[PDB]
Amino acid sequence: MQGDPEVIEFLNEQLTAELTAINQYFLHAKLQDHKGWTKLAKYTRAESFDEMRHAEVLTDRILLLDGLPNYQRLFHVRVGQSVTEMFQADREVELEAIDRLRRGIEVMRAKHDITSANVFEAILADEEHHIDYLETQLDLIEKLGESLYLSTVIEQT
């Protein structure tokens, strides 16, 4: 079994995106932990682990088709200073991933490769869930304010 070059190109691009997201989320979680924001740090760490799992699944699929996974690329990593900036960077990453996923699913399903399409479908569902969470948090920050919002995620122990 040998997949089409275009399918492998799509999968490798998604893999590069996954690696970039992993790095960005881990760095954001560490930065949030250093400031005393504990629950945000826990949530961000869990998100980074989920991205790790996605990268593993993509690597397995690429290996099954007799391709060469790319572990050398990296997209630009965005780092914020306040909470709003971090949320906005995450939203940008998610939007890019969703657009790429939809286009790839269409192209893959047009050439009789169904398993890759299902993989992208699952990843797309997860990305939509995460983006919904991010938008909800941004709305909450907009309504309450920065200080009153941060007062709810600080713990002393």
- Tokens at 115, concatenated: 């398993």
128 annotated as belonging to a binding site for a ligand: no
Phi, psi dihedrals of residue 112, rounded to the nearest 5°: 75, 25
Q: Tell me which residues in 107-126 interact with ligand HEM (CB under 6 A).
A: none
Q: Tell me which residues in 124-143 interact with Fe ion (CB under 5 A).
A: 127, 130
Partner touching 49 among ligand HEM, a copy of itself, Fe ion, none, CB below 5 to 8 Å by kind = ligand HEM
CA–CA distance, 73 with 149 (Å, rounded to integer) = 37
How far is CA 45 from each of CA 25, 50, 105, rounded to the nearest angstrom?
7, 9, 28
121 annotated as belonging to a binding site for a ligand: no
Q: How many CB atoms are located within 10 Å of the residue 60 CB?
A: 11
Can you give the length of the chain in residues? 157
CA–CA distance, 96 with 21 (Å, rounded to integer) = 11
The annotated binding site for heme b is made up of 52
- In the complex, the residues that contact a copy of itself under the rule CB under 8 A are 1, 23-24, 26-27, 30-31, 34-36, 39-40, 42-43, 46, 59-60, 63-64, 69, 71-72, 74, 76-77, 102, 105-106, 112, 114-115, 118, 121, 124-125, 128, 131-132, 136-137, 139-140, 143-145, 147-157
- In the complex, the residues that contact Fe ion under the rule CB under 5 A are 18, 51, 54, 127, 130
